[PDB]
Structures are given as C-alpha cells and as structure tokens.
Design a protein around this ligand. Sequence first.
Ligand SMILES: *[C@@H]1O[C@H](CO)[C@@H](O[C@@H]2O[C@H](CO)[C@@H](O)[C@H](O)[C@H]2NC(C)=O)[C@H](O)[C@H]1NC(C)=O
Ligand SMILES: *[C@@H]1O[C@H](CO)[C@@H](O)[C@H](O)[C@H]1NC(C)=O
Ligand SMILES: *[C@@H]1O[C@H](CO)[C@@H](O)[C@H](O)[C@H]1NC(C)=O
Ligand SMILES: *[C@@H]1O[C@H](CO)[C@@H](O)[C@H](O)[C@H]1NC(C)=O
Lengths: 45, 371, 249, 49, 87, 36
Amino acid sequence: MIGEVVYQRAVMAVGSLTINEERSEVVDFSVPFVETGISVMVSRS
Amino acid sequence: IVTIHQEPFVYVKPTLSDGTCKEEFTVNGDPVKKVICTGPNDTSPGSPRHTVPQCCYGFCIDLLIKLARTMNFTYEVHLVADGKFGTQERVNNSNKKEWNGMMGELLSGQADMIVAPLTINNERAQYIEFSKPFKYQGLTILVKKEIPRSFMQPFQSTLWLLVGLSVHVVAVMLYLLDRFSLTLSSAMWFSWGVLLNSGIGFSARILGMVWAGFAMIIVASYTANLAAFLVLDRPEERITGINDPRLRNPSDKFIYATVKQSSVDIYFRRQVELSTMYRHMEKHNYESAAEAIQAVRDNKLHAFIWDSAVLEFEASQKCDLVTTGELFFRSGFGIGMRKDSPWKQNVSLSILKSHENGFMEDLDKTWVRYQ
Amino acid sequence: SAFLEPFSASVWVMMFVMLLIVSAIAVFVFEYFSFTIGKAIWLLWGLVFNNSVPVQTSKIMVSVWAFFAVIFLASYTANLAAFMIQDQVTGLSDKKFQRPHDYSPPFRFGTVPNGSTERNIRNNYPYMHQYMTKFNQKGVEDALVSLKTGKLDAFIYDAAVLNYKAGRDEGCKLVTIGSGYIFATTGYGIALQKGSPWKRQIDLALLQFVGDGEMEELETLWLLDIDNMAGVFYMLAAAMALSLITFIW
Amino acid sequence: GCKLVTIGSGYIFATTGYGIALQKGSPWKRQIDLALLQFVGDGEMEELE
Amino acid sequence: SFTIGKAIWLLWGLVFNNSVPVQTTSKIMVSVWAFFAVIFLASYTANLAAFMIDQVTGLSDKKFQRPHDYSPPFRFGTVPNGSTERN
Amino acid sequence: TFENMAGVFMLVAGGIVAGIFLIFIEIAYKRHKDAR
Ligand SMILES: *[C@@H]1O[C@H](CO)[C@@H](O[C@@H]2O[C@H](CO)[C@@H](O)[C@H](O)[C@H]2NC(C)=O)[C@H](O)[C@H]1NC(C)=O
Ligand SMILES: *[C@@H]1O[C@H](CO)[C@@H](O)[C@H](O)[C@H]1NC(C)=O
Ligand SMILES: *[C@@H]1O[C@H](CO)[C@@H](O)[C@H](O)[C@H]1NC(C)=O
Ligand SMILES: *[C@@H]1O[C@H](CO)[C@@H](O)[C@H](O)[C@H]1NC(C)=O
C-alpha cells in the first residue's frame, strides 16, 4: 500500500497501517483515529 | 515555550532561597532535569500578580529537552499568565471570537511550540497545526473513593422477646412435667447452654428435644441472613461511563463539573444530544484542575471529569480517589505549534522516534508509574 | 405467607413424609441394633444439634445418619440464603372499580377531563363516569402530586405517559399495573385531513422507520423476615399440643 | 471460548495510531485532518467503535 | 476449680459446637462467651463467602530476554511484511 | 423438591440399608472371632 501511494499510483490509503519513521518520511499521515501498537495476546486461587 | 500547571506533567513549585531549581534525585537515583519558568505564581484575579521565576519539571520537560537536543532549541519555558487552556469566549463587543490562554498566546505571536496536556481538537486544529500525539489517554470520570463498610438484629428486633418468652414457657412446662412425673434458673441456664454450645445439662425429654431442635433454627436463620446480605453491601457504582442512565437526568444533589473551556467543554458543546445535563456543569466550574480535585477530596464535588492521564495518576498518588468509566472521547495530546513553523516534520519525526524507542516508556515509568 | 410453603418447601408434602419415614427407619434400626421410644427417639431428635448434654458399638453405625442430618441442615441454610434475593387492582375488571363503596376508605380515582380517557370510559362504564367526574385533575402535575401525597388512590390516563412518569419518578414509588392489562390498547398515529394526498406516504415512512430500527432507537435515550414471627408461633403451638397429648394420659 | 487475553490495556510497547496515508504534498491533508478531528470530537467515532 | 486445668479447656472447647467432653455459678455467666465465638465464626464465614465470589506485561520480561535459557521453549512469532519486524 | 435432593436421599438410603446389613454380619464375625 505504501509503495502504491508513493509512486503516484494512489493519492490516499484508507487501509489500516501503523506509523513509523520510514513510513512518515516518504508520505505524510493524518491524525490517527484508532489507537494501536505492539502487544502480546496469549492463551490461558 | 508556554506550559500549563498540571501536576502529572508540569510540577510548578517555588525555587530555593537563591532563586534556582532545587537539586532533586528520583527513586532510581538518576538526576531530575529542571527548567526555570517565569510564570505568575498568583492565581486569583485581582491579586498583585508577579512574574516570579519558579521551577517547572515533569513529563513534558523531558520531551522538550529531547527535542532541544535533537533540533538545537533555546527554550525559555514562559508559563501562561492566564493559567487556562481556553478555546473560544468573548468579553466586550460580542461580535468576534478570540482565543485566550496558551492557544491565544501562541496565535498572537509571542509564544511558540507548546508542551502541555493540550489535546487534539477540531477548532484547535483549525488554527494550530499539531504534531503526532505522544499520549492518547482518552479522558475519563473521577469520583471519590467509597469509605470502608448490623451488630444486632437488622430489623424486627422482637426476636429477643420471642426467645425469652419461649425460654420461660419451656422452663415452666419442664417444671410442671417434672412435678407430674429446677427451681429458679437451672432451666434457663440449660436453654442458654443449648443455644450456645458449652456441654452443660418422657414428656420432659421430648420437650427438651423439640426446644433444642428449634433453638438452632434461629441462629441458622441469622447466619443465612448475614451471609445473604452480600447482595447489596452498598458500594453502588458511581458513574460507569458517560452513557449511563443516571447522567441522562441531571440532579442538584449529585454535582459534577469540568474545569474551564478546555477540550471537555468543547466536546460537550459539540455533541448536542443531552444539552439539559450539559448546561448543569457550566454554573459551578473551577479555576484549575488542582482546585477541582481538592474540592472533590473535600467532598465538595461528587464527580470530576478530566483527562485520564491526570485522573489515574492522581488516583495512584493519593489512595482516596477512584476513576469511573473505561474510555470515551479518545483524543491524544500534541505539540501545539504555529502554522508557519518549519519544524513540523522534524518534530513529528522526533515524536515518532521517541514512541518507537523506549524513551516514552522510560518517561512513563519515571513520571506516571508510581505506587 | 410467613414461614409457609411459598417461602420454602412449596410442595410441603414430600419433605414431611421423608422426615417421617427416616425417623421411623432410624428408630427401627436403633431398636434392632436399647429402648424403642425411651432412647431411639431421644437420639433421633438429639442428633440434629451438637449440644447433646444428656448423650449416653451400636451407636457407631447409627451415627452415620448424622452425616445426612448435617448435610440436610447445610442444604436448608443454603436454600434459605438463596431464596431471599429480589399492583392489586389488575385492571378495571375487579370489583374495586365497580363497587368502590364495598371498601371502608372511599376510592378517589383520577382522569384528566377533555381527554381520550374520560371519553373512553363513557362508552364502556356509563354510571362510573359520574363517580370519575367527582375527582378530576387540572393536568398531570396535579394528579402526580396528589398520588405522591395520597389524595388519589389511583390514576387513570394514557399508558405511554404513565409509563414515562413511572420510569422517571423520584423515589420509584409510582408504578403502573404490570403490563398487558391495558383496558383498551390502541396507538398514537399522526392526524391528517380526509382525502389528503399525504397519508399514503406518511404510513410508508412510519413503517420504514419501525422496520429499520429507527423507532426503537428513538424510544431509547428518550424514555428478621416475616418467617421468624411465624416459626416461633408454630413451635409454641407444637409444644403446647405435645404437652396436652402427654398430659391427657 | 474466550481463552485468549492480551497484556492489560495500558502495557502497549509502542503505542501508535493507524490514521490514513496520503500522498506527500497532497492538497487533501488539511481537509482529511479536519474531518478526522470532527469525527473524533463527535459521536461518529464512538458509534463505529 | 483449677486455674488452668478447666478454664483453658472450656475456653478452647466453646469455640466449636461439637464439644462432647465439656463440663458452679460463676462459670455459667462465663459460658456466654460461646455466643461471641459463634458470632465471630459466622461473621468470618460470611466474609469468606462474600470475598470468594500470563507474563510481566512487556518486553522487559526475562522470558523474552532468555527464551532458550528457561526449560519451556518459546516460539513467539510475528507477521512478516509488516511493521512489527521493523519495530 | 427436584432431582438433586431426591437423588442424594436415594443414595444415602441405599448407603444406610447396605451399611446396616454389612455391619450386622461384621459384628457377628467379630464376636465369633473374639469368642471362638
Ligand atoms: C529538518 O530535518 C531535515 C532532515 O533531518 C533537515 O534537512 C537536512 O537533511 C540532511 C539529510 O537529509 C541533513 O544532512 C542536514 O543536516 C539537514 N539540515 C540541517 C540544517 O540540519 C532540515 O534542515 C531540518 N529542519 C529544521 C528546521 O530543523
Ligand atoms: C546542532 O546540533 C548538532 C548536534 O547534533 C550539531 O552537530 C550542530 O553543529 C548544531 N548546529 C548549530 C547551528 O548549532
Ligand atoms: C374542559 O372543557 C370544558 C368545556 O365546557 C371547560 O369548561 C373546562 O374548563 C375544561 N377543562 C380543562 C381541564 O381543560
Ligand atoms: C512477504 O512475505 C513472504 C512470506 O511471508 C516472503 O517470502 C516475502 O519475501 C515477503 N515480501 C518481501 C518484500 O519481503
């Protein structure tokens, strides 16, 4: 998606992607709307 | 730089006798960076305001120092004289809307990039171009912690008279049966021993048997009632989120309010669905979050609404306030800059780098993760 | 009732017969393995409590029923604890509205004049209309304050308004008569003009609203016990009966 | 079976956001930012959440 | 009677109802202590009934630092071609 | 009143009726062994 946006193929990316250093340099992101990040989910007194 | 006095982020305390920041060390032993701020100490209007050079430190100053080291800043940290965030208001010639507080100072030249709990808002973003948020912390509702919580019969206390009459009648019946077949109080002592196990002791036999069988019924019922009293046990849920039935009907008995025309007031004005309740908080607002939380502690205000990063930190620091509601209006913070600032891209990149690395985690551990 | 079948042991037959048969079996086995009634009954009625001061191989095998006795005691305690966790007119069909004079306190009902309720009651209860007109209210506020104070025994009005007021009543001391006992169930609708070329669209719009969930969304966001007293009386009566039976010999 | 659980809610390692990616230097940045801020400030975001 | 030969025995026997080996006037009023004992036992039982109703949450855990050092091996696992690997 | 109490009552009734029968012969055997 980022590659498609960068090389004039698309002008907007509504898909769910995070924000990183390399991501924010090639293209500019708007304000986030969903909080995300790195987390661990594991299976199961 | 302009900052607002907020305890979790900007510790505004008077300097030493000389007039410089006092040397302090954290629990880990590392030195605590401090920056001298020239904000007005006085808060009440009409006082002889003085721009004394206090000392400001906390969560935001570490990020400011990181930005300065990564982009060669010369920050002075001029604390806002108004002591308020401020979004929109008018005083005289009510035909135009002007910004007051940190936002007004930033817009009217003067100040610069803001490191503060200034959240991201629509009208704020219309005139001020923010950066990537460094802490989202959707604002929640703070309430006073419930105080810790029937020695005799809870109700219908005639049971004592009933059991006394039963003891008397079984005693006289036992005496009559013994005479037909032990003077003043032996029978009542035996009844008390039956009620309270202590090993102290045909018509009389069956009478005693049925009396002892019924004796345990009263204590069993008492124990059952005491155990079943766990259902209510008071401790009713305070608020449990904005979208709850008890907040749909405002009441003067349960008073709550925000601080000023901050992001909370703008959110309430924007969401026009319960204006009848929203107008309730307008008449009894407080000058600052510190005053509001002090009033809540003094039981002046039942509930308080503010950013979660402040409410949870205050709850952790002082074990007498508890937050209610999980999350609503999740709007992050930001570095309030000017639309002509050329550092926007680099400020955003620095914020993203801090988020990617452990710098934000270390700052949270050393500034928001307490007992 | 108090300490009766509704409180516990609703059947009130199987438990009694079970107690009788287990008592008989215990007496018989104790006699088979000193006295038929002088000791067997004494032990049977003394094993239910731990304070058996006058307690005196054979007893070892008898004592296994004390496990059942204590299990029954614990089950009864748990059932009593579990079964204590928690609107008489029931419409106009009852004799209270038809014959208010049969009760010593006079009935003071309530209906708002010039409404759809006083008109409705005329065509079904002709003579009752004169009684209703005796107690009338200017509006709904007077009726509600009279109900709170006690001036009106009951209030007759539109179901939706009464339900809203009950749902938003201070202290929750006002409530309608259950649900489903509506005297004349109807709707609200929206008035139009005879032959107006708008009903054919209004009805379709309303049906679309109620079929798309809009109507439900609009509705939302807008609107010591008594047994203790009976138990002591029952045990006293049983003790008196036993004493009389023993004395009649 | 609800047998999967994450590490709390506030223990996110690198707490970031998703957002929407636009082409560099696009003229729609201001409009997208304002619309997202309006959605966050209003109840549309809560309804979708 | 005895200072400790009977008083201690009675005090420790009244705490439980199943006191078979339990035996002028002063002791009678002292026997009401079983009321306090049973009330305290009932209160404790009620409180117990009322109150009877993973990792270290981060990447600083020693399990993540030392996956093969501990006896139970770990696999972790990430989705490639994304941002987690760069992070 | 329902299946639980009725079932436990049946179980304990079977237990006691088996226990009396077994303990009778157990006591008889014990007495015979002690008084051979
Ligand atoms: C913002 O950052 C950029 C890049 O970090 C600066 O542009 C130059 O970028 C090159 C490499 O791309 C560096 O070698 C230069 O040192 C950067 N210039 C300077 C003056 O450091 C850009 O100058 C920065 N802008 C501001 C206002 O700090
Ligand atoms: C800015 O700071 C950097 C430190 O990374 C330094 O190398 C550079 O010389 C500084 N530039 C100016 C103009 O002070
Ligand atoms: C009802 O209508 C009559 C018409 O005769 C009028 O006299 C009376 O005041 C009205 N009452 C109310 C409560 O409107
Ligand atoms: C995408 O993932 C596949 C398998 O996960 C991998 O083989 C491929 O190299 C990845 N693409 C890139 C560009 O690395």
